[PDB]
């Protein structure tokens, strides 16, 4: 069972927030999910991860424990691209991709 990444398409304007929802909760509950931006030539570019890998892309967990809000604060026009949320079981599972548009 892989993670989810909704909505499939997210059209926001230039300046406001943009938030996706990565729904994932495995059979072990010992997981660390990443938030990568896929390049036009299939070369992921990690943005953030939960728990916050300390070393504008927010990652907050909801009370249900299965949904995670991945937010792009003050979405710039260059942020339009492909995004996905991976999941690592302590093994990796990539969620379905999704598009992000910024008018």
């Amino acid at each position, epitope marked *: 069972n892989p993670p989810t990444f909704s909505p499939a398409l997210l059209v926001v304007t230039e300046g406001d927030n943009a938030t996706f929802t990565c729904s994932f909760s495995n059979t072990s509950e010992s997981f*660390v999910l990443n938030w990568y931006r896929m390049s036009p030539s299939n*070369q*992921t570019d990690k943005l*953030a991860a939960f728990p916050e890998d300390r*070393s504008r892309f927010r990652v907050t967990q909801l009370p249900n424990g299965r949904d995670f809000h991945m937010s792009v604060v003050r979405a710039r026009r260059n942020d339009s691209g492909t995004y996905l949320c*991976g999941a690592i079981s*302590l093994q*990796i599972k990539e969620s379905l991709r999704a598009e992000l548009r910024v008018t």
Partner: antibody
Amino acid sequence: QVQLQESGPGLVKPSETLSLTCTVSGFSLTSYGVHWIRQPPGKGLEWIGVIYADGSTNYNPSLKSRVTISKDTSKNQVSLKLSSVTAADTAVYYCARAYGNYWYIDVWGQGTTVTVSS
Amino acid sequence: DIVMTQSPDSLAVSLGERATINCKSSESVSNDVAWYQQKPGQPPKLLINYAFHRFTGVPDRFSGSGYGTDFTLTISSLQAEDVAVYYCHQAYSSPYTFGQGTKLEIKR
């Protein structure tokens, strides 16, 4: 394409300062970090330092006070200076691009062997 | 300075067989670890980024794993063009140290 072309002198006299350069082509030099790496004869890879898009650098504690990494944005070049050179600096220096918000070294340079000798 | 220690200094599995390489860090470099392949004379080549995702144009036979201080690089079926040195690299904190390389050679 995405490249990194290194160029420097073949020889370096002991106690002098070694000057290197990494001419870039393909990507916005003000949007990617360039990392210098050393490869001594018959040995592995050793990190020398980085230069981010803002213009700040991080150096190897063992190499600090001798390394200097700058960049000429109007020329798409990254410079590497090594003062008070000894016979230990003889190696193959590599410049490499850094990709991602949580960076990783993707593209590498061609390499430039430096022989510290008289 | 985090110490990247590759365990199999020299690996010589046969042709077409599985071949894994371990690279353990002395501290938590949790998922900013990249793998590189280098041949004599040529510069390094990247294979795995973030320790799981494989780079573009990289054969499918390559796989990566690890999240703490336990990283691995796996080759499903070893090919003749795979003979090279494989270096791991940490990007967690300075001095972003590397491993020491694992020489991968073919037995025939």
